[PDB]
Write a protein that binds this ligand. Structure first.
Ligand SMILES: CCCCCCCCOCCOCCOCCOCCO
Ligand SMILES: CCCCCCCCOCCOCCOCCOCCO
Ligand SMILES: CCCCCCCCOCCOCCOCCOCCO
Ligand code: NA
Ligand code: NA
Lengths: 343, 343, 343
């Protein structure tokens, strides 16, 4: 009954204050690339099948505007590719999909809403930002109907190989919404993530987990929230690694076309009796020229503990860290969304 | 005069009863992936050029809904990419194309019609199923006009390198149709298939051939057919390998929305005086929720000779065989087709 | 305010008279592939933002019709991927873009207009033809407004890594147009081109430069031009290489549907006190069956100095040279353009 072509183009100039060079000294990194959202194009549709029943699909491909290449592991529909049925009693979808972490926790974070890439937590450790390979393959997802503001669901992501536990995943989450208040909680687990090309997580072991909970509130021109997440690697005789992230964010619309957002995140990682931590704060001014086009300017600052180095997530996990405990990232950019409904 | 965007999304849950693990024991394989048809999207068009003359093109890309990646060798338009001219005296098309085996024999098989992937013959040995890299590169194809139900044509697929015979192919076939009766025969040959990146067959030698003939009949709610194919590798001092496939299939529409199909295939492979064989039978129930959406359920069973192992084709030739002479594949899935004509 | 889907399909049969085989003897190369233009599909749009201000984008992907694969380095939007703002005072665009060489010199060449691939200069040495990886990544481009027929602009292409000069590029050019007269000049420089995956030029060092100038004139059914370009590799203790290209071209419309073009190019390359040269002449007959479809036939002939070998550019830099000082390339082909404006 409807097939929509859509996309988002986001390009900006970014300065990063200190990025290690091969000579070991720190220099600034200048780049052109996605500032807030990862660029993408997609096809989505829904067919009315009568009785509240609908067939739905989404095919969504992320790419780097700087070089035209696929990212998120490099496949065609590297963000989402799924088909399913929606009814009054819930939705079941099959394919490559984001999991409950993304459905129920990301909307409570700056990186998952107005902030995007550079507001991600260190190394995107809790998989909240999707400018990065965070979708899961071979996924069956159930999403409940809305029960008076309560929604819940989960995923199982098959290994697609004769070893059932070798690169699979699952998750569960729930949200509660009421007149501007949003609460969410989620739990996700992977076994042998990235261990092969058939399973749930693309290459790049043991057990990896993300869980968290938070809440946000919106009224008028003001919105804000709090969010806790933990990412954990265990069952490796390597020592367990765990990272906790504590974020507060607020966004205020000065005018209907000018939003300013501020976010702060404290991250604390522990392994084998030792601990490192990062403090990150960012501010973003975003100006809408139309419903489809906005220009933005932002600056993010991160300081690590003295036994560690700073690195603001820029969409590329291979980016070398700062040589110091400090890094600044400042971006000016342009974002354009397009949309065709095929009447 | 018309450009159409289209696609097919097919996702299902498959159980395969016995697939070898690295430890050598057989375990079940559970997977999410294409059940019947390979998922694909495409662009096709035809321009009226006057006098019965038309310009036509098809750009068609297959992909795995489970992980969003291209398959069929991994290129962009990995199923078909061609442009050509159609007239009252026949059609000439240029590009990456299926050959006469696919045009004239596949419609007589369950795997090429209602059955799809898991109804393919062992290892897709006769290239009848297109959930697999069976298109040929660099192809010039002629298709005749309809001469009172007779159609014929063929292909030559260039090596695109200074060695004219190093990775090239050609084929020829013909069909006869009359009021529900269909007859087809075809012959295809490749030399040094997959020996380079420029030629007709993608990587993954000597002379490889497929030929076959069959017939089918449709009237009312009932359709069925018989088909013989042989695949042959020779001119290798390695010993010639040949495989013969004998298939019978029948499909019956219980209701206008519920089809049940049954297929049986006997396959016999011979090499260096020794012989192996497979018996395969499958049943599929397919229920149309609309013209665009259907849900299906099927079960396939294969038994090999005692000097061999069972393996039901699942779209992935790297899938390990069963550790026994038996394998069962059962699938429940969802298929959705979309279409936009751009009025 | 508008999003357009578009594409060009170009397929032809090419004979090349002498291409080296591994045995060292020269044989003819027969191929199916792009004759004139590289096949491509794309999405482009522009939104009216009021006051002469517009948001624009182009996403353009080149591919080989012969095998369905991406070319131009193999990424998704491997020809152009950019977003930007256009105003009365000029245009700024960000992403993967052609540089000033392509904007201001290519329109004065046969290879950049009616001639295409096989009219390129030896090894596409001056990057004038786009059936080849000539776009630059991470590019900021400014294009001025038209000042009474004068247009100018330039590019800077970031390295996107902490070494600012390690795989970056920039360019500048200008044109002057008046009633069929066109003049252009351009200059482009890259440092450490292809040295990494983050920078301006895709893999496949020191300083590489292209510059040139030319003019063309069109009136009625007749058009022609002259163009000089130089490509230079220096700062390598390897010896500097430089190549100068001198081209004359003319195209005449016999009828409104039949164009004949002739081009001649002399190329002279010098390195370490030695010199090689090539003479190339080509003729193309192009017949429009409609505004969207044309069939063409052409022949190109190249003779090299006796200390070198002939090689007519065919879109593939890995193609081996002729074993002699001579090579002929003859092509017959079909080109079809499509277009949908989404009203
Ligand atoms: O739809 C499927 C979602 O269900 C999520 C529950 O996860 C499956 C149970 O796995 C937990 C231990 O295997
Ligand atoms: O259109 C071309 C189709 O023609 C098919 C015939 O194949 C060419 C002959 O090759 C057989 C031995 O080379
Ligand atoms: O818009 C940017 C285009 O400007 C082109 C000028 O190039 C920058 C200067 O670089 C020359 C030496 O670095
Ligand atoms: Na209309
Ligand atoms: Na459309």
């Amino acid at each position: 009954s409807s097939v929509t072509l859509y996309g988002v183009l986001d390009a900006g100039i970014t300065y990063q204050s200190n990025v290690a060079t091969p000579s070991g000294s720190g220099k600034s990194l200048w780049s052109v690339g996605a500032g807030v959202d990862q660029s993408r194009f997609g096809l989505r549709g829904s067919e009315d099948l009568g009785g509240g029943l609908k067939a739905i699909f989404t095919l969504e491909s992320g790419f780097n505007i700087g070089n035209g290449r696929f990212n998120n592991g490099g496949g065609m529909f590297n963000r989402q590719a799924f088909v399913g049925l929606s009814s009054n009693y819930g939705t079941v979808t099959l394919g490559r999909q984001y999991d409950a972490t993304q459905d129920y926790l990301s909307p409570l974070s700056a990186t998952g809403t107005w902030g995007g890439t550079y507001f991600a937590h260190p190394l995107n450790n809790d998989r909240l930002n999707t400018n990065g390979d965070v979708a899961v393959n071979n996924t069956v997802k159930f999403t409940s109907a809305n029960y008076a503001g309560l929604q819940f669901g989960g995923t199982y992501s098959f290994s697609n190989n004769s070893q059932f536990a070798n690169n699979r995943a699952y998750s569960a989450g729930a949200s509660y919404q009421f007149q501007g208040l949003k609460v969410g909680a989620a739990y996700s687990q992977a076994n042998n993530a990235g261990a092969n090309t058939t399973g749930a997580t693309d290459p790049l072991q043991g057990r990896s987990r993300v869980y968290g909970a938070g809440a946000s509130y919106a009224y008028g021109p003001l919105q804000g929230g709090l969010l806790w997440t933990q990412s954990r690697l265990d069952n490796l005789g390597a020592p367990t690694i765990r990272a906790d992230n504590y974020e507060a964010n607020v966004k205020y619309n000065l005018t209907p076309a000018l939003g300013l957002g501020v976010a702060y995140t404290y991250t604390n990682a522990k392994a084998n009796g030792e601990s490192t931590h990062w403090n990150q704060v960012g501010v973003q001014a975003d100006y809408a020229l139309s419903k489809r086009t906005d220009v933005y300017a932002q600056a993010v600052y991160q300081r690590s503990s003295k036994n560690a180095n700073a690195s603001i997530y820029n969409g590329d996990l291979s980016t070398p860290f700062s040589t110091s405990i400090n890094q600044t990232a400042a971006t000016v950019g342009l974002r354009h969304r397009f949309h065709h409904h095929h009447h």
